[PDB]
């Protein structure tokens, strides 16, 4: 969806709350 067919996992600019 959105702009990522992998499901928002590639090279994304956000930290996406990995911490």
């Amino acid at each position: 969806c959105r702009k990522a067919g992998v499901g928002q996992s590639w090279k994304e600019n956000s930290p996406l709350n990995v911490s």
Side-chain angles (χ1 to χ4, degrees):
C1 301
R2 296 276 284 206
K3 235 279 242 67
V6 198
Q8 284 117 90
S9 188
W10 46 276
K11 331 155 291 183
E12 295 210 325
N13 298 284
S14 304
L16 80 120
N17 240 254
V18 165
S19 192

